[PDB]
Each structure stands twice: as C-alpha cells, then as structure tokens.
Amino acid sequence: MSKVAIIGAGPCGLSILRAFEHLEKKGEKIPEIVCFEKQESWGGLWNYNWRTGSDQYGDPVPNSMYRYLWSNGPKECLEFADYSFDQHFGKSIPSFPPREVLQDYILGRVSKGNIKNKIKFNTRVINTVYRNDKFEINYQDKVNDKTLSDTFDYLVVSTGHFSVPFIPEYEGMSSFPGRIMHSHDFRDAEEFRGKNVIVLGSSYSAEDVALQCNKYGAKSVTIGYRHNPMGFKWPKGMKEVHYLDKLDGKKAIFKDGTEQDADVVILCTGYLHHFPFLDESLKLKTHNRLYPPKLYKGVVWQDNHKLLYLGMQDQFHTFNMFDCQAWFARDVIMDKIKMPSDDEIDKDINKWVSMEEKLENPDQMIDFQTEYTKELHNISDYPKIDFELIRKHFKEWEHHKVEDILTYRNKSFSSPVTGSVAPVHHTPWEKAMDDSMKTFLNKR
Amino acid sequence: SKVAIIGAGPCGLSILRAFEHLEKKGEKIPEIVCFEKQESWGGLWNYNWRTGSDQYGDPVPNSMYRYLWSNGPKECLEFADYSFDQHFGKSIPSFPPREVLQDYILGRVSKGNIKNKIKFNTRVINTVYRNDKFEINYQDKVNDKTLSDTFDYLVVSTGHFSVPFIPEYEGMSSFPGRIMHSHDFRDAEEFRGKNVIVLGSSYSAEDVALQCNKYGAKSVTIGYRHNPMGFKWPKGMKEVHYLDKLDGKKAIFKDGTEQDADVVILCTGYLHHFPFLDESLKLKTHNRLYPPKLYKGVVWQDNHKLLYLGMQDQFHTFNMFDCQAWFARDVIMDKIKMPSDDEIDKDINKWVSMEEKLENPDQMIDFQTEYTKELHNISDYPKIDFELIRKHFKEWEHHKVEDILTYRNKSFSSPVTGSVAPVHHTPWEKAMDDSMKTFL
Ligand SMILES: Cc1cc2nc3c(=O)[nH]c(=O)nc-3n(C[C@H](O)[C@H](O)[C@H](O)COP(=O)(O)OP(=O)(O)OC[C@H]3O[C@@H](n4cnc5c(N)ncnc54)[C@H](O)[C@@H]3O)c2cc1C
Ligand SMILES: Cc1cc2nc3c(=O)[nH]c(=O)nc-3n(C[C@H](O)[C@H](O)[C@H](O)COP(=O)(O)OP(=O)(O)OC[C@H]3O[C@@H](n4cnc5c(N)ncnc54)[C@H](O)[C@@H]3O)c2cc1C
Ligand SMILES: NC(=O)c1ccc[n+]([C@@H]2O[C@H](COP(=O)([O-])OP(=O)(O)OC[C@H]3O[C@@H](n4cnc5c(N)ncnc54)[C@H](OP(=O)(O)O)[C@@H]3O)[C@@H](O)[C@H]2O)c1
Ligand SMILES: NC(=O)c1ccc[n+]([C@@H]2O[C@H](COP(=O)([O-])OP(=O)(O)OC[C@H]3O[C@@H](n4cnc5c(N)ncnc54)[C@H](OP(=O)(O)O)[C@@H]3O)[C@@H](O)[C@H]2O)c1
C-alpha cells in the first residue's frame, strides 16, 4: 500500500519499473509508482540529443552521448537476463552495436505493458526532504513552468552520474582562440574535420573521443594524461603526451616539452555525482569509484533505509548489474528482504569498501564487480545469467583493447543468457562511418 | 535591518554603491550580504572561457565573447556619480572594448568596503518568505555545502541574459557541425573559413554575424522569422526568411534559400529564470521594456520587500540600474513609502499600457527615458542629462541604419561632464585586438 517515487527513466529507472512489472504480471499487488523524467522520453544517456548545456526551459542537458557512438564493451556483458538479445532481435547480431541498436533493446524490454504510463516526462525533480516518515518532493512541470508537490514512502534515485561534467581550468584558457569543451558537449565529430584536436584525460571518454576525432577526419589528435598514459596502440596521426602546462595561442604546451598546434581542447575529465534536488541529509557525496560508502549492498542509503540509489558505482558491468540492484531494491520496498542491524550494515559496507580500496588493476576490478553483482543476484528473483562467463568476457575484452584499440569492436562474444555466439559484423568498426541501426542490421 | 542582494553584476553593484553613498555621509545603513556565483564581481562584463556549467556543476552565467565591443554609445550608460573623465582622466572614444567598461564598472566600487560584503562562488538556491523574513538557502560551491540565513529585504539582481532560450529546428539531430546558442559564443576565430548560419533578429544576431565575418567566416547567413534587421550587411553576408530545416551541411529556408552550413548559432534570446525563488516571489515574463507586477519596475507587487533590478529589456543600462537602485535603497530605508495597493496597481497599468503601444525604436527610447527620468526624480542620484541621452540613442539608431559597420566609430558627448569623445585611432572593422591596453 506504499507510494514509491523514482527519479530518472534511464536504464536504472527502467530496471526497477521492470522489476515491479514482473511481480504485477504474476498477480502480485504492487505499490503505486511515480517516475519523474526531465527528458521528453525514456532512455537516459542512451538517447541522442543535439542539445548542449541547457534546454529550452533552462534545465541542464543530461545527455552525454555523441553521433557515431558504438558500444564500448561487449554487449553480451550487459544482456538482460529476463529479456535476451535473441528474444529482442530474433537472431544473433554482432557484439559491439551502435548506440541506436542498444537503445532499441533497452526500450523494447519495457514498451509492451503499462510502464510508460507511470512516467511523467519533461518533469524535473527539484527538492526532496524527509519528514514525518515521508519523502516530500517538489518537481517542476517544465512545459507549464510550474512547481508541483507530492509525498512518497520510498524514494529511488536513478539519475546516473555521467551527465554533470567536471571541468578543470588550465593556464591560457582565457586567451585560447579555439573551442574549449567537455566530452559532455561532444556531438558530431565532423565538426573537427581538418582541425588539430587536444584531448585531455585517461579513461573511456578520452579514448573514444580521440578515436572518433581521428576517424572523422581531424588533422591531428594529441592526448594529454596527468598520471599515466592509456598506452593503447594509437593510429598514425595520434599521440599521447604528459600533462598540459598551458595554452599559448593556437599552441598547447605540455610538461614533457611537447608543443602542439591546437584548434580545440576537449576535456574528457569525468563527471560529478550531483544531486541538487536532495536534502543534504539524503545526498550521496562521492567521486567515481566501484564502491562508494554509505550504501548498503551499494543501494540502500545507510542513514535512511527507504532511500535507494541505483547505478551510482563506476561501471564495468552495466545493465544486468542495474537489474540486480533494482530487483534487490524492489524486494526491500516490498519487505521481502529485511534490513539487518545497524552494526551489521556498517560492517558489511566496510567489508566491500576495504576490498574496493585494495583493487589494483582491471582484472581485480572486474573480479570485484562480478562478486558484488553475483551476491546481489543471489538475494533476489532475477533470472539465470552466467556471471562467470561475463567475468571472462571482460578480461578478454581488456586484452583485445591492449592488442589493438582499433579492432576490439570487431570481436565476437557468446551470450551469458542463451549461449548464442555473435557473428562478425559486415563492416569493421574502423571503417563503419554510418552508425544507423538500419545499416547495421541490414546486409551490406 | 538585514538585506540580501543576489548578483554582483552592474545592478547588484549599483545598489551596494547606493548604500555606500549614504554610509560615507555618516548615515547608518543596514547589514548587507551580496551573493555571487562567479569567482569575482562584474556580472556579464566578465569574460569566461567556460560554457554550459562550471567545475561545480553550476550553470555558467557569462554570455560575453572575445573581441566584444560596447554596442551602444558609452555616453548613454555613464554613471552620474562617477564620470568617465574621473575614471580615465582623459576623453576616450564612445565605443570601448569590453575590458574597458568592465574596468570602469569595478573602478566605481573598488575604493571602499563594498567588495568585503560579497560572498563569491556562492549560489543562492532557495528562497521562501515566512514570519516576515526571507529564508534563504545558498550553496557554498567550493565546500559543496548548503548554508542558510534570514533577511528582511531581498534584492534580486541576477540579470536576464544568462539562461538561453534554445529552439529546435528540423534536422538538428543529424546536422554534421556545431549547433550552439549565442550564450556559448567565445572566440570567433573558431569559425574562420566556415559557413555560419545565424538565427535571430536582435542585438546578438547582429553582432555575432558581424564578429564571424570580421574574423574570417567563409560566409554568414542570417535567418529571420518575422522581419529582417535590414542593415547594410558586408559583402559576404545575407539575410533570409525563416529556417525550414537542416539537411546535412545544408540550411534550407522558407524563401527557398539553400545555404552551405558548417555551424548554426541560435541568437534566439534568453529566459527570465529564477529557480531559487518560491513560486509566490518569482517574476515570470518575456523580454520587454516593462513587465507587470513591478511597481516602478522594481518592487514586487505582492511583496514590497522583494525588489528586482534590471529586469526590463534595455536601451538604457548602467544609469537606469542606478536610478532603480537608488529607488530600491530608499524603499529599504523607509524614505520612500509605498502608496496604496490600488494606487500601485493603477500606476503599473499606466506604464504597462504605454509599453504595449510602443511601435518603433524612437518610441521605445522615449518610453525608457521617461521611465528612468521619473525614477531619477524620486531619489538623490546625481545630475545627468537624460534629454541628451535620449537624443544620443536616436542618433545611434540612425548611425546603425546608415552603416552597421561604422556606427562604433562615432563620437558622443558626456551627459555628465559634456566631454566630447575622440574618434578612436582604429576603425572598428579593422580593430582586431580588443585589449584595453592597446585601445587606450
Ligand atoms: C557517453 C557515454 C557512453 C556510454 N557508453 C556505454 C556503453 O557503450 N556501454 C555501456 O554498458 N555503458 C555505457 N555508458 C554507461 C551508462 O552510464 C549506462 O549504460 C547507463 O546509461 C546508466 O543508466 P542510469 O539510468 O543509471 O543513468 P542515466 O542513463 O544517465 O539515466 C538518468 C536519467 O535520469 C534523468 N534525470 C536526471 N536528473 C533528473 C531530475 N532532477 N529529475 C528528473 N529526471 C532526472 C535523466 O534525464 C536521465 O534520463 C555510457 C555512459 C556515457 C556517459
Ligand atoms: C552578450 C551581451 C553583451 C552586452 N553588451 C552590452 C553593451 O555593450 N552595453 C550595454 O550597455 N549593455 C550590454 N549588455 C546588457 C547587460 O545586461 C548589462 O550591461 C549588464 O551586464 C546587466 O547587469 P545585471 O547586474 O542586471 O545582470 P548581470 O550582469 O547578468 O549580473 C547578474 C549576476 O548575478 C549572478 N547570479 C545569477 N544567479 C545567481 C545565484 N543564484 N546566486 C548568486 N549569484 C547569481 C551572476 O553570476 C551575475 O554575475 C549586454 C548583455 C549581453 C548578454
Ligand atoms: N560507448 C563509448 O564509446 C563511450 C564514450 C564516452 C564515455 N563512455 C562512458 O562514459 C563513462 C565515463 O567515462 P569517462 O572517461 O568520461 O569518465 P571517468 O572514467 O570517470 O574518467 C575521468 C578521467 O578524467 C581524468 N581527469 C580527472 N581530472 C582531470 C584533470 N584535471 N585534467 C585531466 N584529466 C583529468 C581522469 O584521469 P587522471 O586523474 O589521471 O587525469 C580520468 O581519466 C564511462 O562509463 C565510460 O564507459 C563510453
Ligand atoms: N555589446 C554587444 O555587441 C552585444 C552582443 C550580443 C548581445 N548584446 C546584448 O544581449 C542582450 C540580449 O540581446 P539578444 O539579441 O540576445 O536577445 P533579444 O533582444 O531578446 O532578442 C531575441 C531574438 O530571438 C529571436 N527569436 C526568438 N525565438 C526565435 C526562434 N524560435 N527562432 C529564431 N529566432 C528567434 C527574436 O526574433 P523573432 O521573434 O522575430 O524570431 C529576437 O530577435 C541585449 O542587451 C543586447 O544588447 C550585446
């Protein structure tokens, strides 16, 4: 008889709506659920949006995906246990599909029944306090420019953590005569054809953005790193150098002495966990990491067990980890899973944080998130899926990237749900200029 | 008595300055706290390379770009209590680059204890009125912490040209180039050799188009929805009717025009945006010379201790903000008494009715002149010749129609000291370096 609020209708918010649907479909009564989504439509980061900065209502644009974006990990690692690739597509498809394809898969899982009607779109949650055993929530109806209010027994935060950019300042930016942007701003790589591009950062965004710039015709691409280089086998017109010292006109100067003509600087420097719409007492504060503290099983807010965060960990696993988290959260809301004592909660949190701090390389991290996810998987209803296969897949994928960063997307992996082997795509990724679902799925 | 001011741009600084005049004379003044989300005072007059949102996730309020020059005669915006002659110590041309006017603005408030009243990197986030106090929450950005305090009076001076209005046009989802708003514009060199599309029909469209051309754009094409600006555009520039869609690197207009396009710059205006005010306190309006619900254009009709500065559309700027500020100060000080609710409503209607009838720039200049002159006579802001200013604006509009490329080369006389501006050593079209250093 509870009333449940969900903030965000991306993969995480959809995971929990889906978790609740499984129960309703079996005949179980479920709580009233309201899901707030600031975008026009569901899909979260998987929606492409030309917009940058803030929208027509002055709401910051949560979209970070760009044109020509392809799955950066094996799709088999993110398959839904309750909704297989074979079921959705009706045939086996390659392991690294373009964004539109995976978006289609995400929305397909939830588009058959009553989930969509539970979501309020163009609606931005702006304020949350907890009082008298209820979450009092203010939200903006954007189209009408109006503040609305309601009260809930449980609150699920699924707003992701890759939308609000962290944007550091370097010397000389005030006088740089080119574009300075964050990866969050990146939209169509053709913008930089024939240009000298500087990329700053050492993770997935730096890696992929650098490659897209080169692929879509940049004159040069130079990656700066602060601590250690990615060390991948970069294409001809690409180099990796240490630490940007300053910009001096159309000239980037690095600490290792490198001087590079620069037309654009793309800061691929990460994002903030940003929750301006939550009271300070409810607000998770953390940098991007595999296991932030104060989250029992990485989900339940330690100080308020009716506040549940989804997807807030750094990610190797994605979709099916979100599912495992969501099924867990559903079961907490349903009172199927009972919270242990305060001391046992704190002890369990410390166990995972301590392991997390000790992680030293991707193999250890992959093992860590595997064990985290598998433990979640065993406490609830989420269907059979082979996390051991997934563990192996991730490690193979890391090896592929080291082997050849240009060709890792051409590899084939087997489904941890159905066993199906992905066919090799008709077009090598390094030559695949058209990112449409149509050309991917059609022959030739 | 305790007063909060939100924003330390020209308007917030105008009121801090108004209160300072009194304190300097020996009058006791209220405790004043001014919140500013930027690192430093100056408002829009600060250049910031950042776009979108900052390192703390706070939307960037800066909209000015590199190579920006004053777009109206500086003699129309001179401070009555701090002349250009006083500040610069010699006559200088009428259209200075941004840094020059920024230096003038901050110079007026630099000498005293005003700066110490301002909390920087501090963003007001919530405002409610209860028990006769404004309860205000603000984020200390650097520490990522929410702080709270209570005030008797609230002055909102956060401008209205920071949060962009950004309309969608068919084809944007697949356009192979940059789509941006003028609010994003930073350095025109970014577009050298590029086919630029500019959408809009006001000051941002006009100046951005010219900046792109001046800094080597291969072409510039301006789309208008209702009416063209009609200025005498430079050789490589044209003005066409209504963008229909983008189809690849192709901009297609309703009048059939097809134009090669590498970048689309939406110069489509800004929102009055106050997420940090309770719905009951929040001004809702489009850009216009006289929004309703603002007594003398300043006092919130439904709460006479909430005062908005600078929220009108602008011909006048600095010295109008001043007149509004001196007014607001005197209201806060209880020198000026509010009239009855009915006389307030009648007075607002009087000005709104006039504002709705304005038909052309001349009538608008006359309107804002009268609005400003009336404010001027209710307080003690010093002598300044608004009649001369009225004339200057009309002359400037004429200059723009005559030649949009040369209007900044014109000279105007100070309405404060009578000083005649010298013609700058370099014509605007050829003035590439916007540094105050090289200007002076
Ligand atoms: C550029 C990029 C590429 C990526 N590529 C891959 C990939 O190839 N493979 C992979 O497995 N993972 C990828 N990821 C990881 C990605 O985070 C997850 O796949 C997934 O999108 C996370 O889903 P989520 O629901 O947790 O957050 P999101 O997908 O960000 O969804 C959050 C939703 O909440 C909404 N929201 C936010 N604030 C509010 C508010 N105040 N009120 C109402 N609604 C709000 C947002 O509009 C958004 O729709 C990528 C991430 C990024 C940024
Ligand atoms: C691109 C551009 C060019 C212009 N050029 C000219 C010109 O040449 N001549 C001319 O006369 N006028 C010009 N103007 C008009 C301009 O509005 C005024 O000159 C003046 O800047 C207005 O000052 P203001 O204090 O009212 O607003 P602003 O200058 O915008 O100051 C508002 C301040 O409030 C702060 N703020 C906002 N929200 C918050 C919050 N929640 N908490 C704390 N602080 C906050 C902002 O950081 C900002 O510093 C221009 C405007 C623009 C946009
Ligand atoms: N499907 C795709 O192809 C694709 C493309 C983009 C993003 N993604 C996803 O988007 C999510 C986020 O990845 P991300 O790379 O953007 O974030 P991230 O993994 O959190 O990495 C942040 C990077 O910023 C660097 N950094 C921090 N401060 C810096 C500074 N002051 N100067 C320079 N560098 C700085 C960090 O390295 P240092 O501290 O050593 O400098 C780090 O490498 C991930 O899920 C990723 O998979 C996928
Ligand atoms: N010193 C300088 O050189 C400098 C440079 C830039 C800005 N400024 C200042 O910035 C402030 C704002 O000027 P502004 O021009 O940005 O704002 P503005 O005066 O409010 O004008 C907004 C423009 O947007 C247009 N518009 C609205 N909706 C549109 C749509 N859907 N598609 C296309 N156009 C649309 C409007 O024309 P339609 O409705 O007819 O389309 C209008 O011309 C002013 O104070 C100005 O002085 C000064």
Q: What are the tokens at A390?
A: 């997934």
Instruction: Look up residue B68 and give its two tokens.
Output: 């920006």
Neighbours of B356 (CB within 10 A): 10
B273: chain A residues, CB-CB within 8 Å: 58
Which among B48, B145, B189 has CB closest to A178?
Answer: B189
Closest listed ligand to the CA of A55: 1
Q: Which residues in chain A have Cβ-Cβ distances shorter than 8 Å to B56?
A: 272
Residue B112: beta bridge partners?
none
**Which letter, b or e, does each residue of A153-177 get, where b requires 16 or more Cβ atoms within 10 Å of its Cβ?**
bbbbbbbbbbbbbbbeebebbeebb
Residue found under tokens 């930073």: B186
Interface with B, mutate which of A167, A278, A280 (most B CBs under 10 A): A167
B243: left (phi over 0), alpha (psi -120 to 50) or beta: beta
Q: CA Rg, chain A, in Å?
A: 22
Q: What is the DSSP string of B44-61?
A: GGS--S--SB-TTSPBP-
Long-range contacts of B109-114 (CB under 8 A, 24+ apart): B109/B13, B109/B16, B109/B17, B109/B20, B109/B41, B112/B20, B112/B24, B113/B20, B114/B13, B114/B16, B114/B17, B114/B20
Distance CA A107, CA A90 (A): 16
d(CA B1, CA B32): 9
Residue B229 token pair: 């600006």
Residue that has been written with the tokens 């006088």 in this structure: A175
If one counts every other C-beta atom within 10 angstroms of the C-beta of residue A269, the result is: 20
A196: closest chain B residue by CA: B190
How far apart (Å, rounded) are the C-alpha atoms in residues A407 and A429? 7
Q: Give start and end residues of each alpha helix (H) in A240-386.
A: 319-333, 342-357, 362-377
Q: What is the DSSP string of B105-156?
A: HHHHHHSSSSGGGEEPSEEEEEEEEETTEEEEEEEETTTTEEEEEEESEEEE
Residue B331: burial class (beta carbons within 10 Å; 0-12, 13-18, 19+): buried
Interchain CB distance below 8 Å, A165 and B190: no
Q: Which residues have CB under 8 Å from B412's CB, separation 6+?
A: B73, B74, B75, B76, B94, B392, B395, B396, B421
Say if the Cβ atoms of B57 and A191 lie within 8 Å: no
Alpha carbon B415 to its chain centroid, in Å, reads 21
d(CA B48, CA B170): 31
**What separation in angstroms does the CA of B398 have from each of A376, B130, B205, B292, B401?**
73, 51, 19, 30, 5
C-alpha to C-alpha distance for A66 and A309, rounded to whole angstroms: 26
Kindly report the length of chain B: 440
Cβ(A99)–Cβ(A80) below 8 Å: no
Task: Give the up-direction half-sphere exposure of residue A57: CA atoms within 13 A in the CB hemisphere.
Answer: 16
**Full 3-state SS string of A45-110:** HHCCCCCCCECCCCCECCCCCCCCCECCCCHHHHCECCECHHHHHCCCCCCCCEHHHHHHHHHHHH
Ligand 3 binding pocket (C-beta < 6 A) is A 69, 71-72, 162, 168, 183, 200-206, 208, 226-227, 268-270, 288, 315
d(CA B60, CA B57): 9
Question: Within 10 A of A354 (CB to CB), how many other CB atoms are there?
Answer: 10
For residue B369, the CA-to-ligand 2 centroid distance in Å is 21
Measure CA of the first residue to CA of the last residue in chain B; give whole Å.
Answer: 44
Q: Which of B328, B353, B350, B349 is closest to B338 using CA atoms?
A: B328
Experiment used for this model: X-ray
Of B49, B144, B146, the CB nearest to A173: B49
| Residues paired with B220 in a beta bridge | B196, B237
Annotated binding residue B65: no
User: Residue A240: beta bridge partners?
Assistant: A223
- The reply to whether residue B284 touches residue A145, judged by beta carbons under 8 angstroms, is yes
Burial class (CB in 10 A: 0-12, 13-18, 19+), B346: exposed
CA A50 to chain centre: 18
Distance CA A316, CA A322 (A): 11
Tokens of A196: 């000298």
Give the type of residue at B215.
Answer: Y
Q: Mutate which of A38, A47, A52 to test chain B, going by most B C-beta atoms within 10 A?
A: A52
Residue carrying the six token digits 């941006």: B180
In chain B, residues with a C-beta closer than 8 Å to the C-beta of A272 are 56-57
Q: What is d(CA A123, CA B432) in angstroms, rounded to the nearest whole number?
A: 45
Q: What distance in Å separates the CA atoms of residue A103 and residue A3, rounded to the nearest whole number?
A: 29
Q: Is A17 exposed, middle or buried (0-12, 13-18, 19+ CB in 10 A)?
A: buried
Sign of CA dihedral A353, A358, A360, A363: negative
The residue written with tokens 């706290």 in the block is B33
Ligand nearest to the CA of B310: 2
Query: Of how many residues is chain A composed?
Result: 444
Backbone angles phi, psi at B59, to 5 degrees: -50, 135
Work out whether strand A179-182 and strand A264-267 pair parallel, antiparallel, or are unpaired.
parallel
| Residue burial B16-36, b: 16+ Cβ < 10 Å; e: rest | bbbbbbbeeeeeebeebbbbb
Interacting residues of A139 by C-beta distance below 8 A, sequence separation 6+: A36, A120, A123, A124, A125, A126, A147, A148, A149, A150
Q: Parallel, antiparallel, or unpaired: how do β-strands B122-130 and B133-140 relate?
A: antiparallel
- What chain B residue is nearest to A278 in terms of C-alpha separation? B146
* DSSP H helices in B37-97: 84-88
Q: Give the minimum alpha-carbon distance from B387 to chain A in angstroms, rounded to a whole number.
A: 38
The separation between the first and the last C-alpha atoms of chain A, rounded to the nearest angstrom, is 54
- Rg of the Cα atoms in chain B: 22
Distance of CA B62 to the CA centre of its chain: 11
**Sheet (strand A146-152) strand order:** A123-131, A134-141, A146-152
- Torsion angle (degrees, nearest 10) of CA A188, A189, A190, A191: 80
Best CA proximity match to A108, nearest among A73, A82, A129: A82
C-alpha A73 chain-centroid distance = 12
Helix axis angle, A342-357 to A362-377, nearest 10° = 150
